Amino acid sequence: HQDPWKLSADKPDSNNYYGETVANGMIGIISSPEPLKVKEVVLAGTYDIYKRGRVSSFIPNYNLLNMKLAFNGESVQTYNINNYKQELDMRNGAFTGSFQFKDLATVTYSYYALRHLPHCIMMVVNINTQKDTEINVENLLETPSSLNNQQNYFQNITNTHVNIPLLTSVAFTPTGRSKIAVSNTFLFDEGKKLQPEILHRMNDADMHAMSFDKKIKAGKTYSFALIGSLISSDHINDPYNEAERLTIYAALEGKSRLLNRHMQEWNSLWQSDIQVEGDPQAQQDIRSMLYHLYSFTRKSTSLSPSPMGLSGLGYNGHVFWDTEIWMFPPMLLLHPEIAKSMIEYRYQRLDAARKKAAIYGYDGAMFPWESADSGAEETPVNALTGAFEHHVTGDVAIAAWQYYLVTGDKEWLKEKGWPILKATAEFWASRVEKNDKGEYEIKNVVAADEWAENIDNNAYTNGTAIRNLQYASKCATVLGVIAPKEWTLIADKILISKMSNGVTREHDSYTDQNIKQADANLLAYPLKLITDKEQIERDLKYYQTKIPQSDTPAMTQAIFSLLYSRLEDSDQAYHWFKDAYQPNLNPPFRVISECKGGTNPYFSTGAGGVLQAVIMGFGGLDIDAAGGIKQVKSVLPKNWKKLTITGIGIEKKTFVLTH
Amino acid sequence: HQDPWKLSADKPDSNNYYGETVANGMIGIISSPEPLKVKEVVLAGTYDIYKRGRVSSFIPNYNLLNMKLAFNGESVQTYNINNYKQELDMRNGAFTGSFQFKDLATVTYSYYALRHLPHCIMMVVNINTQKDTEINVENLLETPSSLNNQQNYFQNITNTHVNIPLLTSVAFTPTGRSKIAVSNTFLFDEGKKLQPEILHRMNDADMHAMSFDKKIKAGKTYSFALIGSLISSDHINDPYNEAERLTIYAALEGKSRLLNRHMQEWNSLWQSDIQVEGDPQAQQDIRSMLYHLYSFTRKSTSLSPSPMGLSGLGYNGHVFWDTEIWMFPPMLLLHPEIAKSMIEYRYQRLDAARKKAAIYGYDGAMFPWESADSGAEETPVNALTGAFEHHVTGDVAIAAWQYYLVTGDKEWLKEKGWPILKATAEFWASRVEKNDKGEYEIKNVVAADEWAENIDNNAYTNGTAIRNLQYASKCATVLGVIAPKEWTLIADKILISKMSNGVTREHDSYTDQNIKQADANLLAYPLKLITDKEQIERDLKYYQTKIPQSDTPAMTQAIFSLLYSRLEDSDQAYHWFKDAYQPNLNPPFRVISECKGGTNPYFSTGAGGVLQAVIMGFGGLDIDAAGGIKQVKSVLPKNWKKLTITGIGIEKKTFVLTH
Numbered sequence A, B: 001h002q003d004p005w006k007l008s009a010d011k012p013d014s015n016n017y018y019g020e021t022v023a024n025g026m027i028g029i030i031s032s033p034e035p036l037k038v039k040e041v042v043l044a045g046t047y048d049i050y051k052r053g054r055v056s057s058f059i060p061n062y063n064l065l066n067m068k069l070a071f072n073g074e075s076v077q078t079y080n081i082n083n084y085k086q087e088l089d090m091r092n093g094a095f096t097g098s099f100q101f102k103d104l105a106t107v108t109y110s111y112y113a114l115r116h117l118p119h120c121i122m123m124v125v126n127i128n129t130q131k132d133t134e135i136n137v138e139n140l141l142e143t144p145s146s147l148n149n150q151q152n153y154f155q156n157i158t159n160t161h162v163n164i165p166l167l168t169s170v171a172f173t174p175t176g177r178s179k180i181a182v183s184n185t186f187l188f189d190e191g192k193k194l195q196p197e198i199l200h201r202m203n204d205a206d207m208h209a210m211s212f213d214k215k216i217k218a219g220k221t222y223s224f225a226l227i228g229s230l231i232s233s234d235h236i237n238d239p240y241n242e243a244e245r246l247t248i249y250a251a252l253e254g255k256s257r258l259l260n261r262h263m264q265e266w267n268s269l270w271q272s273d274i275q276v277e278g279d280p281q282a283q284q285d286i287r288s289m290l291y292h293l294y295s296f297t298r299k300s301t302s303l304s305p306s307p308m309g310l311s312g313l314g315y316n317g318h319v320f321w322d323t324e325i326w327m328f329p330p331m332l333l334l335h336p337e338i339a340k341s342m343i344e345y346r347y348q349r350l351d352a353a354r355k356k357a358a359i360y361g362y363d364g365a366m367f368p369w370e371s372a373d374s375g376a377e378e379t380p381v382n383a384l385t386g387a388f389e390h391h392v393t394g395d396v397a398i399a400a401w402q403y404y405l406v407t408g409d410k411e412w413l414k415e416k417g418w419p420i421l422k423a424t425a426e427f428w429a430s431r432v433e434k435n436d437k438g439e440y441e442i443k444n445v446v447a448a449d450e451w452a453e454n455i456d457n458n459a460y461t462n463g464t465a466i467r468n469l470q471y472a473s474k475c476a477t478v479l480g481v482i483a484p485k486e487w488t489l490i491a492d493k494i495l496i497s498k499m500s501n502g503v504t505r506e507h508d509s510y511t512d513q514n515i516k517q518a519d520a521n522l523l524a525y526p527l528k529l530i531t532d533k534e535q536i537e538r539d540l541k542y543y544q545t546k547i548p549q550s551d552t553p554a555m556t557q558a559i560f561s562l563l564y565s566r567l568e569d570s571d572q573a574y575h576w577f578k579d580a581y582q583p584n585l586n587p588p589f590r591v592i593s594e595c596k597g598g599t600n601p602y603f604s605t606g607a608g609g610v611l612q613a614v615i616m617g618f619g620g621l622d623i624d625a626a627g628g629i630k631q632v633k634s635v636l637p638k639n640w641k642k643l644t645i646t647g648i649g650i651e652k653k654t655f656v657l658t659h
C-alpha cells in the first residue's frame, strides 16, 4: 500500500470508510464504498442557504454516476461480489473499482472529473465474461433532498450517424437562488444500428433512470461509457440547454479525445512534483497532498478553494485565509497560474470588501472572514470571527504582494495587486488607534488563536497589519507612486510586545493560556517579522506545548516543522512534520481530517501547511523580499536520502537536497 | 425476554436495529438506537408528492423529541454510557430508555403518543445523581429534508403563575400542499420563580433549539417533561396557532392529568385481549400484534391504517384491502368502534369511488386499489394493480356488511352501509360480461395473486363480486327495499371453475404457476363460498406449496393456519401459524417485516392476518351469516394449555379454549 502514485483499498468496509475525491476545480466526486455509486457531488461557485450556519453553503448535488448493474436479472451488491478493490490513480485523478461477480464476469469502472472540461464527468465500464451472460445497466438521476422543484426529462438527439439518448434533470437550490441542470448519456463502441435500445423510467418523484440490456458471450469484453454534464445558473444563464449541449459535445468528441485531453492536463500539473527517496510512505503522503491541491484548484479562473476543497460541504465551501496563508504559498512556488486564480478570487471581490469596510466604519477594503459568491461576509453570526477576526485583510495583502515577488508581473501589479494593496492599507490605517506613547494599537479582535476573543494587540493580527502597510508602500514605489507617509509611520509603531521571559506575547491579556493554533510563531514564518534565531527558538519553546491534542486544527505543527528545519534541527523538524497530519488520517485512503482523530476529511488547508513544511522547510525554498525564489539553510529527516522539488518559480527550477 | 407486556433491548446495536413505534392512531414515533432521540415521526392524514411512486405519500416529520444531554459540559453519546436498555411497555405504549453516565447519574426517559390527544406527545426525563453534577439540556427542532420554507420561532407565554417557553416550527410539504406546525415546551416541577431560564439558539437554516442548565446535588432526583404538539393544514385550517394553543393547553393540564387520561384509554383498549398459557413467546408475540393494531387505529374517526400503520412510509401510507380483509376483522370482533372508523374512511370516500367508476367506464362506486386523502386512485402508474386489481371494491362491500352483521346497527346500515353496498353492487353489475352459455365473466384483472396480471375470472375477484352482490341484496331486504333482481341472477352465475383434479382454478390461464399469496384459498376463508371440508383440503393441498419462500408477503400462511384449525388439524394449523410471522421478525423487538427475511417493518397487515388465525382459527370465532359472533370447531397448538379471548362482540363475551 506504498505505491507512490496510487492509493488502494481492498474490500471497502462501509462501517469505517472515508471516500476519496476526484475533482477538476469545478466538480468534486467523493467515492462510496458501494460498487458503481458515488457518495456526494459538489459544484464550485453554487451557494445557497442550507443547513449549517444559516448562511450560504455548497449544496450536495446529483450523484450523477450512480448505476445499477444486473447479471441475468441478479442485482450486483457489496454482498454478492468478491475480490472487490478501489484505487485512486493520483497521476490522472482516475478512481477505479474492480470486482468479480460469481462465475460470470470481472467488472472494472474508472471515473474522472475531466480536467479540461470543468462541467463534464465520465465513467468507463469494462465487463470481461467467464460465461455467457445478459447485463442490465441502469443510470439513475436521483434529485438529492438538498434540491427542489425538479423536472426529469429524456430525449433522443439523432442524425444519420448517432442516437445520443439524454437523461436530464433540472432542479433548484433551497431558496430558488440557483437552477442546476445535469445531462447524462451512454457512449457505445458499436455505433447507432447495433447499440442497445435505451429505456426511460420515471417511477418516483425524485428519481428517473435510463437503462439497457446487453447479451455478452463468454470470453468477451464489453465496454461503454457514461458522460455527464453538471452546471448551474451561477455558471451560465441557461444551464438546462448548456448541460444538454455539453453532453452532446462530449459524446461527439468521444472517449479517446476526452481522456487524451484529460491526461495531457494532468501530465502538465505533475511537471511540478516532490520526490522523496528512502521513505515510500512520505512519498505517497506528499503526492496525495499535491494531488488534492491540484484537484481543488484551477488555473485561468477566479476560483478559490474552501478549507475542504471539493471533498464535501466542510465550512460551507467558504473561502478563508486558509487559501492566502495555507494553500496559496505551495501553489505559488509550483504553479503560479493556480496562485493567480486564488488572488483573482479576491481581486474580483474588492468592491464587496470596500462595502464591508464602510458598513463596519472603516476605510478601504475589509475582506470578510468567510467569503462565497459576492465577497460579502458569510460567517455564521454566532461565530464572533465574522465580526472581529480582522487579520484576513492583511492575509489577502500578503498573498497579493507575494504573487508579484514570485512572478515579477508589473502589469498585474498595476491592474490588480496595487488596487488590493492600496485598499487594504487604507483599511489598516483607519483600523489602528494611536495611544499617548505614540504607539499604534489594534484593539478588540479575535486572534489567529481563535480561543482568544475580544482581546487587544494580537501578535499575528498586528504583524499582518505591519506587512500589509509595508508591502503597499513597496508596491507604490514599484509603480512610481508616493504612498501616504502615514502607512510607514503606522507600520513602524504597531505594538508587538514581549513577556518578561523575552517571549512574543500573543495578546495584551495573554500569560500562559492554551492556544488553538499557531499565532505568535507565525511572526517567524510566514511573516518573517522575527528573524533572530534565538527569538524564533524562545517562541517555539514557550508555545509548542500550548496547543492541546484535542479539537485543534492542522494549522500549527507544519509551521513548527518548517521553523525547526530553518534552525537546522532535523529531529524536531521531522517530529512536527509527522505530528502535523499522521494523527489526522482516515482510512482507507489516508485522507486528512481537520483535527487529530477527526472524521471530517479532506482538510486541504492541512495539506497546504504540510507542503510548506516540505518545500520551504526541508527544501529551504523562500520568497525573497527583493523578488524571486531563494534557498536558505535546511535539514532533511534522518531517513530521507534525497528530496527533489521540480517546477519551482517562473524559471521552473529543480532543487535536489541530500545529507 | 418473554415478559408478556414488555419488549426489552439491552445495548441497542445500531448495525442491526429496527425501531419500535408508539402511536395514538394520529402520530407515530419510531425509536432510534441513540439515547434521547427518535428515528422517524409520521403524521396520519398528511400526504404530498414525495419520493416513491410519483404519487401522494406520508412525509417524514419533525423528530420533535430529539434532545442533547450534557453532564458537566460532557455530551451524552452511545459510546460513553453503560447499562443502556430500551423497553416498550405494550400496556400503555410507553417507550423507555435507561442508562448510567460514568460515576455521575442514572437517566430514564419515557415517551408517549398521548392516547386521548391525537396531536400531543410527551417525554418525561428522570436524572438520579450519584455525584454533584450540572446538566445541560437541549431540545432540537430540525426541519427534515422532506419539508421546505421553514420558520423557527420562540416565545414566552406568561401570567402571574407560569412561564411556558414555546419552541415552534412551521414548514411545508414538498409541493406546498400541507403546512405543518410543531410546538414544544419544557414542563418543570419547581414552578415559575425557580424553573431554569430557557435560551433559544437559531444557528442553522434547518435547526433551532431551546436549552437550559440545572445544578443537581449528589443523591437527588431531578425530573422534567418535554410536551410537543404536531398538526397540519390537513387537520385544522390554522396549524401554527393550533399547535401553540395545544402545547399551552397540555402544559396547564400538566403531566399527571395527561398520563392519567393516557393510561385510562390504554386500559380500555386492553379490556379486549388474548391470553395464552403454556407458550410465553406466543403470548408476547400476540400482545405485540394487538398493541400495533391498537396503536395504528383510532375509534370515533374516519382514519384507516396503511399496511405499515404509523411505523414509517411503507406503501406511501396508502390504504388498501389490507384494512378491509386483514386488519379490520380482528378489530371488528375485539373493538367494533375501531372497525367503524375503518369503514367510515371508505364511506367518506364514496363520492371519489363513484368518480373513479365513471372515469373507467363503469357504474356505481369503484374503490381505488390505493387510497389516501381524497379517495381517488393513488397507485403508482407503473403498478398495473391501480388500473386492473378490482377486487378492492368487493372487499369494501364485505367489510361494510360484516360491520352490520357484528353490531346489528340498522341505523348505520341505512345511513352508511347501504350507500356502500348499493353503489359497489352497481359497479359489479356493470363490470361483468355475460357469455353465450349465460355465465358471467370478469375479464382482464390483476389477481389477488398479483403475479397473475391481465387474466380472466380470478377466483378471489369473482368470489368478492358474488359476495358483494349477495350482501347488497340482503342489505336491501333488511331496509325493506327490493334489490335489482339482476344482482342475484349475476351472483348465481359468476364463473368459479375447477381444474381436472377438482381444485379451484385461480384464473382461466392457471395450471401450476407459483403464486404470490393466497387467492383461491380465500374462497374458503374469509369468503366462505367454499364450505365443503374435502374441497377446502384439496385446495390447500394444491396451493400451499405454490407460494415461494422469497419476496412473498405475510398474506397467506395465517389463512392456511386458520383453515387447518377449522379442519381440526392442530399440527398443520400450528406449523402455518409460526411460518406466518416468525421468519419475518426483525431485532431487537421482534417487529414484523412484509416478507420472510425482510427489513421493512412494521407490516400491520401481517399482524392482522395472524390475529385472525388466533381468534377465528384457534378460537373458532366466526361472523355468523345471520348476525353476531358464533364459535365453530377448532383445535389449539399441542403446547397451548389455554387460549382466553376477551371483549368479543357487542356483548363483550370471553371465550376459553383448552385441549
Ligand SMILES: OC[C@H]1O[C@@H](O)[C@H](O)[C@@H](O)[C@@H]1O
Binding pocket: A252, A253, A254, A257
Ligand atoms: O470526434 C473526435 C475525432 O474527430 C475526428 O474528426 C478527428 O480526426 C479525430 O482526431 C478526433 O478524435
Ligand SMILES: OC[C@H]1O[C@@H](O)[C@H](O)[C@@H](O)[C@@H]1O
Binding pocket: A307, A315, A320, A321, A322, A448, A450, A516, A517, A553, A555, A605
Ligand atoms: O479552516 C477554517 C477555520 O477553522 C478554524 O478552526 C481555525 O481556527 C481558522 O484559522 C480557520 O480559518
Ligand SMILES: OC[C@H]1O[C@@H](O)[C@H](O)[C@@H](O)[C@@H]1O
Binding pocket: A053, A315, A369, A370, A379, A380, A383, A385, A386, A450
Ligand atoms: O464558520 C464559523 C466558524 O466556525 C468555527 O469553527 C471556526 O473556528 C471559525 O473560523 C469559523 O468562522
Ligand SMILES: OC[C@H]1O[C@@H](O)[C@H](O)[C@@H](O)[C@@H]1O
Binding pocket: A383, A450, A451, A516, A550, A551, A552
Ligand atoms: O477547538 C474547536 C473549537 O474552536 C473554536 O474556536 C470554535 O469557535 C469552535 O467552533 C470549535 O469547536
Ligand SMILES: OC[C@H]1O[C@@H](O)[C@H](O)[C@@H](O)[C@@H]1O
Binding pocket: B252, B253, B254, B257
Ligand atoms: O391542571 C390540571 C388540574 O387542575 C386542577 O384545577 C384540578 O383540581 C386537578 O384535578 C387537575 O389535574
Ligand SMILES: OC[C@H]1O[C@@H](O)[C@H](O)[C@@H](O)[C@@H]1O
Binding pocket: B307, B315, B320, B321, B322, B448, B450, B516, B517, B553, B555, B605
Ligand atoms: O400490502 C400492500 C400490498 O402488497 C402487495 O405485496 C400484495 O400483493 C397486496 O395484496 C397488498 O395489498
Ligand SMILES: OC[C@H]1O[C@@H](O)[C@H](O)[C@@H](O)[C@@H]1O
Binding pocket: B053, B315, B369, B370, B379, B380, B383, B385, B386, B450
Ligand atoms: O404501490 C404499488 C404496488 O406495489 C407493489 O409492490 C404491490 O404488490 C402492489 O399491490 C402495489 O399496488
Ligand SMILES: OC[C@H]1O[C@@H](O)[C@H](O)[C@@H](O)[C@@H]1O
Binding pocket: B383, B450, B451, B516, B550, B551, B552
Ligand atoms: O414478489 C414481490 C413483487 O411482487 C409483485 O407483484 C410486485 O409488483 C413487485 O412490486 C414486488 O417486488
